[PDB]
Amino acid sequence: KAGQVVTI
Amino acid sequence: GSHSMRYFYTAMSRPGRGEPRFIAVGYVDDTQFVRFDSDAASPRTEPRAPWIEQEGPEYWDGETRNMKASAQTYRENLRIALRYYNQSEAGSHIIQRMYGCDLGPDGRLLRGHDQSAYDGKDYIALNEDLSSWTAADTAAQITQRKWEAARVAEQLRAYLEGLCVEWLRRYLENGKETLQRADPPKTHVTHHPVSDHEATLRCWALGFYPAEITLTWQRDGEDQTQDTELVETRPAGDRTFQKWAAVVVPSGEEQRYTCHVQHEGLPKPLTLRWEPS
Amino acid sequence: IQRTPKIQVYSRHPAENGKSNFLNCYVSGFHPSDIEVDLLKNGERIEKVEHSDLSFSKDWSFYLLYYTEFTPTEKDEYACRVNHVTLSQPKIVKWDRDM
C-alpha cells in the first residue's frame, strides 16, 4: 500500500 | 529471511508534449506487484503479481486515487523545481522517488527509506532516524526547511512503521508460496578458447530468486576481483534472474580456477570448476 | 547529466533449436528515461514485442526488459536495436546464444 506525496 | 517493500515513482516533464508523465511501480523484494501510468488510456493502479489480485475494489480504488493525486503533486513539484534551480520552462526534467520498509528475519521493522532525486541526482533523503533529512544542495535545503516546519518526517515515520510494515506482512502471507521461496541458481562453467594459449572460463548462474547473488573466480584460492568480467544481474522474465562471471586464463591452467557461488537458496556456498568432457 | 544504456541480449532459457523460448533485451543504467528499443530478426523489426514497467536502480538509472516469444533456429539471427539521447546513432547488439 502506497504512502503520500507532499510538495517540495 | 529479510524482506522489503519499495515504491518507485518517476515524474517526467515534456514541454510541448502535454503535462508531465507519472509512472509508479511497487515491489516486494524483487517481485513487482502494482503499476500505474498516467499515460494509460484509463490510468488505474493495476495488479502485476497473482497474489495481489485478491485485494478488493476498495484497495484498487484507494490506490488509484492516491496515484492520481500523487501525479498532480509531482506536476506541481516539477514546476517548483524550475524555480529552485533557475531553469526555463522549455526543458524536460525528471523527479524520482523510492521509498519503503525493510523487515528483518524476525519480521520486525529493520529500517525505513524515503529518497528523492532531481534529474538523476540525489535531492533529499529521510535519515535512518525517520525524523531528520539530508539535503543534497541548497535547493533541497529549501525543501528541508518547508518539511521541518510542516513536520513531514513524522507523517513519513508513521507510514513507514505502521501501514508499510502491516501491508508488507499481509503481502508476504498472501504471496507466501513465491515471496517466501528462494530458488537456488543452476550453475555451470563453460570454456571457450580465445587463442592457442588463452581460454575464457565463464561461470553461469541461472534461474535464481531473489536477485542478490555473489559469483567470484579464484585462481589458486585467491579472488580474481580485478581480472573478472561480471555482467549485471538480469531478469529472465519468469521472475528469476541470471548472471555470469568470466576470466581469461592461460591454456593448461584451467584447473587452478574455481568459481564460488553464494545465494540465499543454497544451503552452503558452492564451488565449481570447468569439467571437460 | 546523462547516462547511456547498457544492453544485454539473451534468452529466457538456454537456446535449443526448434524449442520455443523468449528473446530478451535488457537495457539498464540509462538516464533520462525515454528510450527506443526494437527487437530484430534477420535485420527486420519484430512487431510483437512487450516491455516491463519503467523502474530504476538505487543510483536513479532506469531499466527496462523488452521481450518476445521466439523459436531459435541454426541460421536465424536476432538483435536488439537501441536509441537514446546519448547515442548519435542506434546501437545494434546481436544475440549471442552463449552470452
Numbering used by the authors:
A (entry chain C): 1 to 8
B (entry chain A): 1 to 277
C (entry chain B): 1 to 99
Authors' account:
Without the C-terminal tryptophan, the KAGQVVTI peptide failed to form peptide-HLA complex efficiently and only a minimal amount of product was detected. Crystal structure analysis reveal that allopurinol non-covalently facilitated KAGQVVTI to adopt an unusual binding conformation, whereby the C-terminal isoleucine does not engage as a PΩ that typically fit deeply in the binding F-pocket. Importantly, the isoleucine of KAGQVVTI and VSFIEFVI do not engage the F-pocket to take the place of the missing tryptophan. In contrast, the extended confirmation of 8mer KAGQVVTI peptide causes the middle part of peptide to be buried deeper in the peptide binding groove. The P4-Gln residue forms hydrogen bonds with Arg97 on β sheet and Gln155 on α2 helix. P5-Val interacts with Ser70 on α1 helix. P6-Val forms hydrogen bonds with Asn77 on α1 helix and Trp147 on α2 helix. Therefore the re-oriented conformation of the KAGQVVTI peptide enables additional hydrogen bond interactions at P4-P6 that stabilized an otherwise unconventional binding without a PΩ anchor.
Allopurinol, widely used in gout treatment, is the most common cause of severe cutaneous adverse drug reactions. Despite the known pharmacogenetic association, the precise mode of interaction between allopurinol and HLA-B*58:01 remains unknown. Taken together, this data demonstrates that allopurinol, and to a lesser extent oxypurinol, may enable the loading of unconventional peptides that are normally suboptimal in forming stable peptide-HLA-B*58:01 complexes.
